[PDB]
Design an enzyme around this catalytic site. Structure first.
Site, PDB file in Angstrom:
ATOM      1  N   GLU A  44      -5.047  13.324  -8.731  1.00 44.37           N
ATOM      2  CA  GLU A  44      -4.154  13.181 -10.097  1.00 44.37           C
ATOM      3  C   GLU A  44      -4.309  14.014 -11.069  1.00 44.37           C
ATOM      4  O   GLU A  44      -4.048  15.164 -11.037  1.00 44.37           O
ATOM      5  CB  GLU A  44      -2.827  13.006 -10.026  1.00 44.37           C
ATOM      6  CG  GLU A  44      -1.870  12.064  -9.389  1.00 44.37           C
ATOM      7  CD  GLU A  44      -0.749  13.828  -8.381  1.00 44.37           C
ATOM      8  OE1 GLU A  44      -1.049  14.067  -8.915  1.00 44.37           O
ATOM      9  OE2 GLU A  44      -0.049  12.974  -7.470  1.00 44.37           O
ATOM     10  N   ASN A  85       4.228  23.209 -12.471  1.00 43.31           N
ATOM     11  CA  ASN A  85       4.679  23.083 -11.129  1.00 43.31           C
ATOM     12  C   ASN A  85       5.506  25.224 -11.010  1.00 43.31           C
ATOM     13  O   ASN A  85       5.906  25.488 -11.856  1.00 43.31           O
ATOM     14  CB  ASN A  85       5.641  21.625 -11.037  1.00 43.31           C
ATOM     15  CG  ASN A  85       4.928  20.773 -10.905  1.00 43.31           C
ATOM     16  OD1 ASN A  85       5.256  19.823 -10.776  1.00 43.31           O
ATOM     17  ND2 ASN A  85       3.977  20.892 -10.483  1.00 43.31           N
ATOM     18  N   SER A  95       8.723  23.252 -13.785  1.00 46.02           N
ATOM     19  CA  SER A  95       9.111  21.380 -14.238  1.00 46.02           C
ATOM     20  C   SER A  95       6.620  21.969 -15.080  1.00 46.02           C
ATOM     21  O   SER A  95       5.883  22.478 -14.309  1.00 46.02           O
ATOM     22  CB  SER A  95       8.920  20.267 -13.270  1.00 46.02           C
ATOM     23  OG  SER A  95       8.610  20.693 -12.685  1.00 46.02           O
ATOM     24  N   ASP A 115       3.940  18.297 -14.645  1.00 46.24           N
ATOM     25  CA  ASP A 115       3.255  17.580 -14.388  1.00 46.24           C
ATOM     26  C   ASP A 115       2.279  16.580 -15.583  1.00 46.24           C
ATOM     27  O   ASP A 115       1.622  17.500 -16.328  1.00 46.24           O
ATOM     28  CB  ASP A 115       2.540  17.411 -13.567  1.00 46.24           C
ATOM     29  CG  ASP A 115       2.766  16.929 -11.731  1.00 46.24           C
ATOM     30  OD1 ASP A 115       4.425  17.223 -12.191  1.00 46.24           O
ATOM     31  OD2 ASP A 115       2.045  17.693 -10.790  1.00 46.24           O
ATOM     32  N   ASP A 141      11.274   4.399  -6.705  1.00 49.38           N
ATOM     33  CA  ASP A 141      13.224   5.691  -6.131  1.00 49.38           C
ATOM     34  C   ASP A 141      13.463   5.574  -5.167  1.00 49.38           C
ATOM     35  O   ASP A 141      14.659   6.046  -4.456  1.00 49.38           O
ATOM     36  CB  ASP A 141      12.376   6.775  -7.022  1.00 49.38           C
ATOM     37  CG  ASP A 141      13.145   7.722  -6.953  1.00 49.38           C
ATOM     38  OD1 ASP A 141      14.690   7.225  -7.841  1.00 49.38           O
ATOM     39  OD2 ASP A 141      13.534   8.321  -6.679  1.00 49.38           O
TER      40      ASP A 141
END
Ligand code: CL
Ligand code: CL
Ligand code: CL
Ligand code: CL
Ligand code: NA
EC number: 3.2.1.17
Length: 129
Positions: free
Chosen positions: A35, A46, A50, A52, A101
């Protein structure tokens, strides 16, 4: 901050990620590697607008507030800039919510594509843990 591989594994273990929700420590170090390359300051935009943030590339559509992702949530209740600190507490606490989640660490596409099914214990081999 750019963490060492064993340095990150140790910080991750102290903050309770070893086998959190059933995911061994090497999964988390592997995910961080692909990542962010272990860089707390990594940011990436993104396609949906959005961004990251941080060691585990936590996204602003759902998890943190950066003031520029319309219609997004802040489920970890933090500014996204907290995810870039050399202290990884914010990132670990948010990742605990994310991994809880429903989809496990499949929430991290890089984990699904590059870590899942591999010998993740390699990522902590040699470390004093
Ligand atoms: Cl492991
Ligand atoms: Cl926003
Ligand atoms: Cl830390
Ligand atoms: Cl799971
Ligand atoms: Na947000």
């Amino acid at each position: 901050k750019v963490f060492g591989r064993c340095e990150l594994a140790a910080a991750m273990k102290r903050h309770g990620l070893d086998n959190y929700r059933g995911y061994s420590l090497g999964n988390w170090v592997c995910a961080a590697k692909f990542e962010s390359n272990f860089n707390t300051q990594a940011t990436n935009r993104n396609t949906d607008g959005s961004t990251d943030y941080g060691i585990l590339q936590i996204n602003s559509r759902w998890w943190c507030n950066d003031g520029r992702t319309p219609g997004s949530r802040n489920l970890c209740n933090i500014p996204c800039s907290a995810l870039l600190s050399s202290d990884i507490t914010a990132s670990v606490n948010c990742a605990k919510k994310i991994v809880s989640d429903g989809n496990g660490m499949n929430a991290w596409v890089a984990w699904r594509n590059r870590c899942k099914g591999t010998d993740v214990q390699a990522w902590i081999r040699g470390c004093r843990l």
